[PDB]
Design an enzyme around this catalytic site. Structure first.
Site, mmCIF file in Angstrom:
data_model
loop_
_atom_site.group_PDB
_atom_site.id
_atom_site.type_symbol
_atom_site.label_atom_id
_atom_site.label_comp_id
_atom_site.label_asym_id
_atom_site.label_seq_id
_atom_site.Cartn_x
_atom_site.Cartn_y
_atom_site.Cartn_z
ATOM 1 N N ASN A 30 0.865 -1.172 0.000
ATOM 2 C CA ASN A 30 0.000 0.000 0.000
ATOM 3 C C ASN A 30 0.904 1.225 0.000
ATOM 4 O OD1 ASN A 30 -1.940 1.973 0.169
ATOM 5 N ND2 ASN A 30 -2.172 1.786 2.371
ATOM 6 N N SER A 32 2.995 4.189 -3.083
ATOM 7 C CA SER A 32 3.037 4.943 -4.348
ATOM 8 C C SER A 32 2.261 4.235 -5.476
ATOM 9 C CB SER A 32 4.509 5.015 -4.831
ATOM 10 O OG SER A 32 5.224 6.068 -4.276
ATOM 11 N N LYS A 51 -3.104 -5.780 -7.703
ATOM 12 C CA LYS A 51 -3.125 -4.350 -7.515
ATOM 13 C C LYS A 51 -4.570 -3.898 -7.816
ATOM 14 C CE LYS A 51 -1.669 0.026 -9.510
ATOM 15 N NZ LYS A 51 -0.657 0.992 -10.025
ATOM 16 N N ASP A 144 10.548 5.195 -13.658
ATOM 17 C CA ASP A 144 10.675 4.958 -12.245
ATOM 18 C C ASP A 144 11.606 3.769 -11.934
ATOM 19 O OD1 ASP A 144 10.406 5.913 -9.602
ATOM 20 O OD2 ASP A 144 8.577 4.683 -9.287
#
Ligand SMILES: CC1(C)CC(=O)C2=C(C1)Nc1n[nH]c(C3CC3)c1[C@]2(C)c1ccccc1
Length: 347
Positions: A30, A32, A51, A144
């Site tokens: 839980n 980003s 997810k 990322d």
């Protein structure tokens, strides 16, 4: 105990919804990346990650659309997706579960004041470079890349890139947001407000990951978004006027004291292999176009040990698959195949 049945489309495959049953449900994430559950598939007994994200129908889900294209051994696979629950709907992505990450493993070493053996650094970096070659070949930039988004099965040493929640198809001429990536891994273009950036930001980030695995800590530990540049300057020195323009054509008032690069060999510990340092230097370059491509990085002599026929994991087993390239993956430079697929691995 508690069985849940949903109707779920396979992630890659013909668009054919099937009943899927899972059990042994718990929160493992839980962050980003959203709320994520672990669950066990009833048929195969196989553990997966789910997810669950609130999805407005007044647009399509970018991450969904990206994950639906991807099929690669070094990328987290979307097994299925499904919709669930006001008249409120949740997209659910059923993804590979892997118990570790490169971040966790590296932290385990570092806290013990130890260095991750270079063979693991090789294995992990090579696999990240392949995942990058593959996504880049579709115009997708991850944006990322950091050790936390590198899933890692500690026994097989297979790595999978995950968390495509920041990922995006880059199109020449469509501008994109600057303040993106995690700070320590953020390319200097982005720090300079660039909006016309390419998928070579992923490679800068990959560079930082390499450097961190060799240093046992982040190479550019910025106090703040602007201070991140300062940390970069401490090693690369100040960028030239022409580097600044290559990073961001709009950046004008460049008022700064010229600082010399620190030599690369003195950046790392005394006995760091020179092929590793040389690889770094060609990844952490101001000028975005100067940085290696993922495919080229894969072909670098730092990774030659992995192309040895007799190479093994330290635990005694065979390395994971390293040479199953597709022509998609190779499309940016098909001749690289002669290095990348060595003699022993085509029979
Ligand atoms: C690293 C931990 C201990 C905790 C965690 O968040 C994930 C794990 C196990 N194991 C995981 N396996 N697969 C996934 C995600 C859904 C694909 C995870 C998670 C959800 C993950 C990993 C990396 C980045 C984001 C989220």
């Amino acid at each position: 105990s508690k069985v849940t049945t949903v109707v779920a489309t396979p992630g890659q495959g013909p668009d054919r919804p099937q009943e899927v049953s899972y059990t042994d449900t718990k929160v493992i994430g839980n962050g980003s990346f959203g709320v994520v559950y672990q669950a066990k598939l009833c048929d195969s007994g196989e553990l997966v990650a789910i997810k669950k994200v609130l999805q407005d129908k007044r647009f399509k889900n970018r991450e969904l659309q990206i994950m639906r294209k991807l099929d690669h051994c070094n990328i987290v696979r979307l097994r299925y997706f499904f919709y669930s629950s006001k008249d409120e709907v949740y997209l659910n992505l059923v993804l590979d579960y892997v118990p570790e990450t490169v971040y966790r493993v590296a932290r385990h070493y570092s806290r013990a004041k130890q260095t991750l053996p270079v063979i693991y650094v090789k294995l992990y970096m090579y696999q990240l470079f392949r995942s990058l070659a593959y996504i880049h070949s579709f115009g997708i930039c991850h944006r990322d890349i950091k050790p936390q988004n590198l899933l890692l099965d500690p026994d097989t040493a297979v790595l999978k890139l995950c968390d495509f929640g920041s990922a995006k198809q880059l199109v020449r001429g469509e501008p994109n947001v600057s303040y993106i990536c995690s700070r320590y891994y953020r390319a200097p273009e982005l720090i300079f407000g660039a909006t016309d950036y390419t998928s070579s930001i992923d490679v800068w980030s990959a560079g930082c990951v390499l450097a961190e695995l060799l240093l046992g800590q982040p190479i550019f530990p910025g106090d703040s978004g602007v201070d991140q540049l300062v940390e970069i300057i401490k090693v690369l020195g100040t960028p030239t006027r022409e580097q600044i323009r290559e990073m961001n054509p709009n950046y004008t008032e460049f008022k700064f004291p010229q600082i010399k690069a620190h030599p690369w060999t003195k950046v790392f510990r005394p006995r760091t292999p020179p092929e590793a340092i040389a690889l770094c230097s060609r990844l952490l370059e101001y000028t975005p176009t100067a940085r290696l491509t993922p495919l080229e990085a894969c072909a670098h002599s730092f990774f030659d040990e992995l192309r040895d026929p007799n190479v093994k994991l330290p635990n005694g087993r065979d390395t994971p698959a390293l040479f199953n390239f597709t022509t998609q993956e190779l499309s940016s430079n098909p001749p690289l195949a002669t290095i990348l697929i060595p003699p022993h691995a085509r029979i």
